[PDB]
A paper describes a structure:
Gram-positive bacteria utilize a Fatty Acid Kinase (FAK) complex to harvest fatty acids from the environment. The FAK complex consists of [name], an ATP kinase, and FakB, an acyl carrier protein that brings the fatty acid substrate to [name] for phosphorylation. The N-terminal domain binds ATP and is where kinase activity occurs. Each of these structures formed a similar overall fold comprising a bundle of eight α-helices termed α1: G7-L31, α2: T41-N58, α3: I64-G78, α4: G81-I98, α5: S106-K122, α6: I132-N149, α7: C153-N173 and α9: S186-L202 and a short helix termed α8: A176-V181.
Residue numbers in the entry: 0 to 210
Write the structure that this text describes.
């Protein structure tokens, strides 16, 4: 089985399964956070952000991926909350901007769209802290760009993205002393990986069940 092109219907499903997988793990993500500051529970905030995106998408489906991305982007903007939820919205509003003109995308454009999200979030900060959700997103996009050059199949691509995203996540305690000593990976990066894992599920035809 393989995926050569992703249209608005499949992207909508990726968004839905990614959001549900993140929602199932939101309490986990919150509990990994070393800095549960006021209104700063990472799992809660990323879940609110992603779910607002999900809800807009579910009420305005479209087979044109660019139009669906604009709907996703709108929901992300309204839902964005917290440091990690805002970064999540920059990553995916940048992603959606990169496909706004398209009706479907191939593996190369999928990878370029992840990269466009990373560049958005980096353009919006002056020297970001390594060891955070941004680091995981950066390494995931780098992987996507490397792999897309000789993989037409978006399933195989997304699996690779997840493997390397997970490597980056597990390495975040080596970038920040506080994570190594507490003994946890970065919570925002964990939440991001939950979204990616749901994307793969959608690409495989599979449903994330509600916890």
């Amino acid at each position: 089985h393989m995926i050569s092109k992703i249209n608005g219907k499949l992207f909508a499903d990726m968004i839905i399964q990614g959001a549900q997988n993140l929602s199932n793990n939101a309490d986990l993500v919150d509990s990994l956070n070393v800095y549960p500051v006021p209104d700063g529970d990472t799992g809660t905030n990323m879940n609110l952000t992603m779910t607002s995106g999900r809800e807009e998408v579910e009420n305005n489906l479209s087979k044109n991926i660019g139009e669906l991305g604009k709907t996703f982007s709108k929901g992300l903007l309204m839902g964005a909350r917290g440091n990690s939820g805002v970064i999540l919205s920059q990553l995916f509003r940048g992603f959606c901007k990169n496909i706004e003109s398209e009706s479907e995308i191939n593996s190369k454009l999928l990878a370029e769209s992840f990269q466009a999200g990373v560049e958005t979030a980096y353009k919006a900060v002056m020297k970001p802290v390594e060891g955070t959700i941004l680091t995981v997103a950066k390494d995931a996009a780098q992987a996507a760009i490397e792999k897309a050059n000789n993989t037409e199949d978006c399933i195989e691509l997304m699996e690779y993205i997840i493997v390397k995203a997970n490597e980056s996540l597990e390495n975040t305690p080596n970038l920040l002393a506080v994570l190594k000593e507490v003994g946890v990976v970065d919570s925002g990066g964990k939440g991001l990986l939950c979204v990616y894992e749901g994307f793969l599920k959608a690409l495989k035809g599979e449903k994330v069940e509600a916890k």
